[PDB]
C-alpha cells in the first residue's frame, strides 16, 4: 500500500 | 485539492522530458501515494508509475521500467517524472492521479489532473488554414455555416478556437483525416444565424505547437 | 494481471438498463474500480472495491468477486455517453480496455451545406470542396460527389464527429480534393446526401466562378 497509514 | 501536471511537449526519439505534478496545498500531498496514468490519443488508460507517500518505494509498469524515474519533494508539494529514452510508444497524455481513500489496499483514483500531452516525433510540418466561407449554398434557411480548413500538417494535434474561446456553441471540430501525403487535415465548422453575417465577426484561431504556428483567419462571407 | 471488458461498444436508448462486465486474468478479490471518461476531460471515479459507490448518481451499481465483475446503470440518461473502464488494485494497478456507450435516439435528418474552395487555396494550386452534414442520427449516411452531373470516385475523404453529449447527434465531413487545373476544367460541383431521415436525397451544389 503506497498510502501513509493515518 | 487539485493536481496540475506540467512539462509536456514535443521532442525527438531518445530525448528526455521531466514531467511535474503540483498539488494544491489543501491536498495532503504527504499522505498518499502518487501515480502516473497515461493515455495514447487513440487507445485507453495504461498505468505507468507510482511513488510511495514518503518516497521510500516506487513501482513502474514493465512498459517503462528501466527508462522512467520518479521522485517527490514533499516540502515543495511536487512529484517529478523523469522520462528518458523516449520512443514513439510514449506519445500520450500524462495524468497524475491519487487514491485518497485508505484501506488495506489503495488504488481507486478519485483525484486526477487535466494531463500533459507528450508527443515523440521527428517530422514536423505546419498547417495551412483556409476559410470555409458562408454563401447561398451554405445557408439552409435562417442558419448559415462557416468554418476553417486546416490542411497538410504534422503531427497531431491542432487546436482550433473561434474568437479566442468566446464562441463554442454549435462548433464542430472534426477528427483529423490522414491524407495520401501522410499529413493530416481537418475542418472546424460552426452554425450561425444568416442574418448575423454582416454584423458579427468570426475568426478561427489555429495553433500547432510542433511547428510554432499560430494563425487567426477572419472568415468573411462570400456573399454569393 | 490482465483485465478484459465486454462488450467494447454498446448502444442503448435513454431509460434502458445497461450492463458492463469486467474479467480478470487471475483472481482479484474485491479491489476493483469503475471509471467514466467523457472524451473531453480526465476520468471520473464511479465505484470502488467492486460494489461501494461514492459516481454520485444512485443509478450506478457494482457487482462481482474473484474474476467476474459487472457495472450496471439503472436508467440511462443522455449524459452517460462515455467510455467506461474497470481497474483492479489487488496486485499493483492495471486497467481494462474500456467500453464505449453510445445512445440511441430518434431519427434526425442532416442539414447539408457546401463550401467552394477559398480564393487563397486556389492561388496555391489545390482546390478542396467541402460538404457538411450537421446534427443527424443515425450515423450511417451516404454522400456522393457529382461534377458536371458525373459521379466521382477516389478523391474524397470523410470524417465523423463523436456523438454530441446534448442532442446525441453526429456531424459528417466530406472533402473532395482536386488540383487547380482539374478544378477549372469543370463548372458545377454537387453533393448528393442519402440518409434515413431524408425521404429524397438532398443535393447542395454550386457553379464555379460565381
Author numbering:
A (entry chain P): 2 to 7
B (entry chain H): 2 to 35, 35A, 36 to 52, 52A, 53 to 82, 82A, 82B, 82C, ...
C (entry chain L): 2 to 55, 57 to 94, 96 to 213
What did the publication describing this PDB structure actually write?
The vaccine is based on PfCSP, which densely covers the surface of sporozoites and plays a critical role in the P. falciparum life cycle from the development of sporozoites in the mosquito midgut to liver-stage development in humans. In this work, we characterize eight monoclonal antibodies (mAb) derived from protected volunteers who participated in a phase 2a clinical trial of RTS,S/AS0131 with a delayed fractional dosing regimen, and compare them with three previously published mAbs derived from the same clinical trial. Co-crystal structures also reveal conserved and convergent use of aromatic residues for interaction with the NANP repeat region.
Overall, most mAbs bound strongly to the longer NPNA peptides, except for mAb395 and 366, whose affinity remained well within the µM range. The overall Kd values with BLI were similar to those obtained from ITC, with mAbs 395 and 366 displaying the lowest affinity well within the µM range. On the other hand, the most potent blocking antibodies displayed comparable dissociation rate constants (koff) in the range of 10−3 s−1, whereas the less potent mAbs 366 and 395 had faster koff of ~10−2 and ~10−1 s−1, respectively. Perhaps not surprisingly, the anti-NANP antibodies share a similar kon, but can differ substantially in their koff, which explains the lower affinities observed for mAbs 366 and 395. The low-affinity mAbs 366 and 395 performed less well, as anticipated.
